[PDB]
Each structure stands twice: as structure tokens, then as C-alpha cells.
Ligand binder design. Sequence first.
Ligand SMILES: [NH3+][C@H]1CCc2ccccc2CC1(O)O
Ligand SMILES: [Cl-]
Ligand SMILES: [Cl-]
Ligand SMILES: [Cl-]
Ligand code: NA
Ligand code: NA
Ligand code: NA
Ligand code: NA
Ligand code: NA
Ligand code: NA
Ligand code: NA
Ligand code: NA
Ligand SMILES: [Zn+2]
Length: 868
Amino acid sequence: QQPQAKYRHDYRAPDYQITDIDLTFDLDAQKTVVTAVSQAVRHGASDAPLRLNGEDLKLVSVHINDEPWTAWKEEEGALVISNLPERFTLKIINEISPAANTALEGLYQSGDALCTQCEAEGFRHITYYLDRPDVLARFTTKIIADKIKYPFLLSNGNRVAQGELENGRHWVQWQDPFPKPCYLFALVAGDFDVLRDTFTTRSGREVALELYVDRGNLDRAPWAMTSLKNSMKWDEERFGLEYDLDIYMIVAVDFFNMGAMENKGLNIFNSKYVLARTDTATDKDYLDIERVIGHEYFHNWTGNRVTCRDWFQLSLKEGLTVFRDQEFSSDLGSRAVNRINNVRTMRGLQFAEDASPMAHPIRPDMVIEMNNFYTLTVYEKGAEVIRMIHTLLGEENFQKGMQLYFERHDGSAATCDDFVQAMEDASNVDLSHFRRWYSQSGTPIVTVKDDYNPETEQYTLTISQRTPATPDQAEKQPLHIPFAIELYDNEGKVIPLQKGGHPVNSVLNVTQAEQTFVFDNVYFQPVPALLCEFSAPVKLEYKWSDQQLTFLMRHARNDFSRWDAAQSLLATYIKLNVARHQQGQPLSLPVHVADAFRAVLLDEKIDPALAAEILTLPSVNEMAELFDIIDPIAIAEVREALTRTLATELADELLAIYNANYQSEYRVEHEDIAKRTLRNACLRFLAFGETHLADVLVSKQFHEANNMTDALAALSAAVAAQLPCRDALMQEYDDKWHQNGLVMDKWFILQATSPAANVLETVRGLLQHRSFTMSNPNRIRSLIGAFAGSNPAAFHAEDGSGYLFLVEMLTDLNSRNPQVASRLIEPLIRLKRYDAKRQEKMRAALEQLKGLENLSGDLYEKITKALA
Ligand SMILES: [NH3+][C@H]1CCc2ccccc2CC1(O)O
Ligand SMILES: [Cl-]
Ligand SMILES: [Cl-]
Ligand SMILES: [Cl-]
Ligand code: NA
Ligand code: NA
Ligand code: NA
Ligand code: NA
Ligand code: NA
Ligand code: NA
Ligand code: NA
Ligand code: NA
Ligand SMILES: [Zn+2]
């Protein structure tokens, strides 16, 4: 039988705590023997049994105070031990098999290395334990292994003992002084190259930094090391937080379901978020390494020193740590580009989740499989909620709140409500209504109407809000929405906001279903900028004229507003042209719209970083969110037609800006990255110029590129525009790079997202490619996941072939690696957003999956919601 849902309202403090655990691993890939000696204390009723979680363990023995115990039973997922004293020593010996662990949860093999992933509930795959994050224990870990195969034996904390044994084995013992929940346990065993460096904290603590990579990869490690030092310095400067241990280890592994993991003092990272060299990694890879290194470092305080009482509180650490990583990237780099791209993710991907059958509040109320809740909502919307607190409080108050949060909760497992209370108490800002953001799912819609009264020189905004019902929640209530505005006069000058002789804050508190805001001394009919810096995670309904939007593109003070105005301008014409496509009619675009983009190209005063984003059209997933019923073929074809029309109308300006932004030196420096992003944004359109001009330009860039950013931009353009050189360039890239999986992932993505008519045949054939394997999550995501999630036009082919392909892949992955399967099923659970014929085929696919033998809980949860 499938597992039953668990509910946030059922939280109960544990009947037993474990204060200290001494682990011994006698390591082997086929068989590992685990000995766990735990010091336990009863907190609950004297007759309560100890209920330990365990999965796929071979129990060898149970002792209580060294007495072999008879009062125990194994049940599904558990070991239940009765008749215990109030305080006692529990000793469990059990066996596990890392080589059999294809799910990559618990202790498993990554190539020749052994490594762990314990979040959320993986430690119970290692031993029988209280695998819940409000149980905080001091760990000591002894690792015994063959010395030749496993010369490095790592766990959390500091090395406290080591020895050698007969028959070529050796051992190391680690001690981590900070009590932790078991999801933060890590173990690594293998042979590695190690990059070693040092960071000295502002108070003088010297921290040894160690980055473990596969042999031969040292020259790909310096950027990650530099980013770790940058993260440590920034957390000191911005948050006043120092690292708290003596060593900081990071291990890069090739086989990893997640991007990275914040295990205390021993982070484990997917190699994608560590390894970089300029010929193999793009600017985006460099900035993603920076943000993920930062994210995991920032968890040391927001997640580790203060952890989560229960898994429904996941956003307590994830929303806050994502906010921290965004602030880090934004401070060091381009704040406008960071904000823009985070808003693209919110509007184009998280909004889709929040109206889907999987919709949940950032603090869920009901979960079947927790590892399904590591979501865009919990992370990205979670961060938007933190950012709204920051908007309401300001930086100084926000940092006072952080300080009070740590003062109260350091060394504990806390709740979202605890965090909000700390912010409220430190700042004196009332967040009682604001708390509804934690409990209500769905995207609010904010509708704005305006009126300018020339007789009284008053401007009035009438603002309404509503959240449509979602499948998880029938009751919706108004939220406390921080709604930032700016008003512009006819010369683009800001109009001071005031009423009754007093200044009015530009962040309006939209707290009611409907309310009005009156501003006086408004000497001219304003052009408003609304929802500035995306001040709340909402859909905005305001009846813009095209002229208001092009005005904002020329005059708005914040770069984000200029980009956002361009998005609103495009939205009207994307919608127009999708409707036209459905009636067989070609693209129609007023001249004045093309001219707004011409002006961006020719404006010497605009930051190239901003111009590049304005000249990057919304993705097909961003476009889908504009529509009640998604027509993925119309969207894809309109996106191409819009690209072609702009390429034709702007051909001379695009080429001039492309050439003007040429850089002979390659540097991973923000100003250079911006110029390159602008040059390559122009290239996307130039690829749709006259076929031969485009073919020459694109092939030249590919062959002359001195860095992977420019080479991949050219290759992507050859695929997108189906240029003559495409097949030759794609083969050259394969021949050069086939032994490098991270580099080939880029090529698999291009294959999977190709506009070619035969894309599915190509994708299917690539299941046999020398660089592809179903054993590697990165390869799976880059080929299969990109097809289903990033090529909706082909995934939603009207013959249903895309659904049948995904069913085949999920039939394999349901058994092999359910976490990856559950990420890959997401496109099918969006069926109610599609036309009836597509829904019928998608339902049939889901019903096939529902009937699988040994259906994983991961997929069961999503399938059940989708078929309801
Ligand atoms: N705590 C981990 C959990 C794994 C995971 C899943 C989804 C996005 C990011 C991450 C990285 C993380 O650091 O947040
Ligand atoms: Cl073995
Ligand atoms: Cl590696
Ligand atoms: Cl700005
Ligand atoms: Na004892
Ligand atoms: Na910055
Ligand atoms: Na589970
Ligand atoms: Na997981
Ligand atoms: Na009006
Ligand atoms: Na208006
Ligand atoms: Na302001
Ligand atoms: Na292969
Ligand atoms: Zn995280």
C-alpha cells in the first residue's frame, strides 16, 4: 500500500531524543556494516516505545546498555523497541549495500567513490534512527576501508583519530561538536585530487578550505575555491556571520540527484556546480557555481546553526538561503540582471506550479513524499516572501531581525513562525496579516485602475486583489501585499508622493480586497511604474497603453522597471499573434513596437547588462503563463516569428551592436559578461537574417570563439535557426567533447530543444549515444527532461508521441531513481492547462503510470493529484 499523507497540524515533540551518536562504518561497495551507538533520553510517557525509522536495512543486532534486547519488532519502515529505561545506550548493527543503491539516497556509489545524500530522509537508509530534524545529536564517525581504493575517508567536523589495520585497511575518526539533525550527516570515501587554501575570518580564525575533485580535475577547481572565499567574506560583511569550524570541505561528485548539499563542514556538490575552465564552462556556469557555492555556505547559519523543527518548515531555511544567495549574487554582480532572471523564474515557472495540481503554500500542510516538496514554491516563492519582509522592514530592521532570530534559536530546530516573530519583534512592524503568505497557495492577481483629477491635482489608484482557488485550498483571503510605485512627469522626473502635506511611502500596503490610495500635489498626469522591483509575487492587471510602456523603457529610474515595461509591451503582441496563429494568420506587429527595441539597441547610456535582457525574448514557459489554455505549438512558432520579424526590422542595428561588443580578451568579470550577453543576444536575431549571411556569421563565431560562452551561443543559434552549418558544428562539438559529460549536457539540451521536425526521433536515438546514460541524473535531465519541460511544442506533438516517450522513460526511472522520475513527470501533471484532445492523451499516459508495478510514492503523489 502507498504511504499515507502526513499533516503539519499533527506535529508532536519526539518521545525520545538522541543526544550523541557514535557511528562506525566498515565500508564496502557490495556490503557496508554500520555500528551505531546512540545515547538516548526519554521525554514522553514512560510506556512509550522508541520508534526508529529504517529503510532497506539488514538488522544484525540490537543492544540496550550492552544487553541483547528481546522487546523489539521490525515493521514497515521501522524498528519499534519497547520497555526501555529513561536513559540508555542503544547499539544497532546493520548492513547496507551501496552498489545496489540506484536511487542515490543514503550511502551510494558515485563512480568509484562512496558518498551520501541524507536530506530529507536518507539517513534511515544507513541505520535505524530518529530521522526527523528536531532530533539534534553530536556525531562521532569512524570510517574503516581499503586504503588503496579509499585513501580519503571524510565525515563532518575534525579528524580526532586515525589508524592502520591488517590486510591493507585503514581508518579515520571524525568529530563534529555541533549537535545536528541526521539530514546533515555526510560520509565520503574515495581517491581525489585536493585543492587546499585558507580563509581568515574577520576575527582571525584561520579556516582550512579543501575542495575534493576527481583525479585530473585540479585545474577546474580554482573558481569554486574563489567563490567559497567570496561567500565567506560576503556573509561577514552583509550579515555579520563567520564560519564556526576549522575545516570547510567540498566534494564534487558526478552522480547526485540534487545540485548540492550543505552537510556541516562537508558539503557534497554535483560536479556541475564546482568544475569550470573557460573552454568548457560558460559565463552562466561560472555565475551558477558562485550562487550554489554561496547558497550552501549560507546554509551554515540558515539551516545548520538554526535548523527546521519539521519538514513542513523547509522554507524556513530554503526561502531564506535562496534570498541570501540572490543578495550575494546581486551585490557582487549585476543586481538588475539577477532580479530580472529571478522574476523570469517566478513568472514563467513558479506561477505555473502554483496553479497546478501540485500547488502548495511555501509552508505545506500535507505531504506524502517530502522529496517532492523541494520546489520552485518553497525555494523561489519562499525567497520572494523573505524579500517582502525585507521590503517592509528595510535593511537595518531586517538585520536586527536576523540577529534576534539567531539569538533566540541558535542551536535549535525552529519554525517559519519563529522567524516571522523574530522579524516582527526586532522591527516593531506588525507581520500578523503578513503570515498568511505562509499558509495560502496560489498567485494573487492585483488589479489597478487610476484616475487623474486636474481640478484637485490628485492622482488616485484603486487597487484590488484576489487569489483564485487552487486544487489544494478552497478558501482564499486577502494578503498583505507590499506594492511599490513610482510616478513620472512628462519629462521623466519622479513626482514626490505625498498626501495632506505629508510624504507617503512608495511601498503601498495593499491589505484589503479593494482600496484606494490618493496622492496630491501631482502637478502633471503621471505615468506610473507599478509593482516596482517585483515587490510582491503577484500578477498585475493594469491597462497600459503602448506609449506609457515605451516611455518607461526610456525613462524609468530602476533598470528592472525598464525591462518589466518591455515585457508588458511584448505580452500584448504575443497574445495577439498566438490568436492569429490559431487562425492561420501571420505575425502582425506595429512599427512603434519594433522601434522601441531599436531605441534600446542605439541607446549608449543603457547598461549593456540591461539591454541584453530587454533583447532576450520571454521563454516559451514565460509565454505560456500569459494564456488560460496553453497552445504550445502556437507559442513556439510565434516566438520564432517574432524573432524573425525583429531580426529583419533591426538587421543593421543588430549587426552594429554585435560588432561593437566584440572582446578579444575573455574574462569572467561582470562588465565583460554584460557586453558578451548583449553581443550574443544580438546574435540570436542575426541567426535569422538572410540564410548565407547568418550561416557565415554563426559558423565564424563558433570556430573563432576563445571561450565556451561564445561557442555555445553560436551552436545554439545554428540549431535554433536550422542553419546549413548546424549538423557540421554539432558533430564537431561531439567529436571534441564526448568524454566530458558536463559539456555534453549542453549539447543534449540543444538536441532536445531543437525546432527540427524530427527532434523526437533524434532524442530517442541519443538514448544510445556514447555520452548518455540512464545511470546519471545530469544526462537524464539534459536529454529527457529538457525535451519534456523545455520543448513543450514537441512534447505536446498532437500525435501524442511525446507523452508515450516520457511514459517509457518514467517506467524505467520509477524503479531506478524515483526522485529523478518525479522531476521528469511534472510536464504531464499540467494537463488541465491544455486542450481537450491533449488532456485525454495525457490522462491516458498518467493512468498507465498509475498502474505500474511497484509505483514509487514519489510518482503516486503527483499522479493522484493530476488525475483528480
Ligand atoms: N538543502 C539542499 C536540498 C537539495 C536541493 C533541492 C532543490 C534545490 C536546491 C537544493 C540544494 C539545497 O542546498 O537546498
Ligand atoms: Cl566491495
Ligand atoms: Cl569531480
Ligand atoms: Cl537600476
Ligand atoms: Na548506558
Ligand atoms: Na551589484
Ligand atoms: Na517518504
Ligand atoms: Na531529495
Ligand atoms: Na481610469
Ligand atoms: Na490608465
Ligand atoms: Na521609497
Ligand atoms: Na551511452
Ligand atoms: Zn538550500
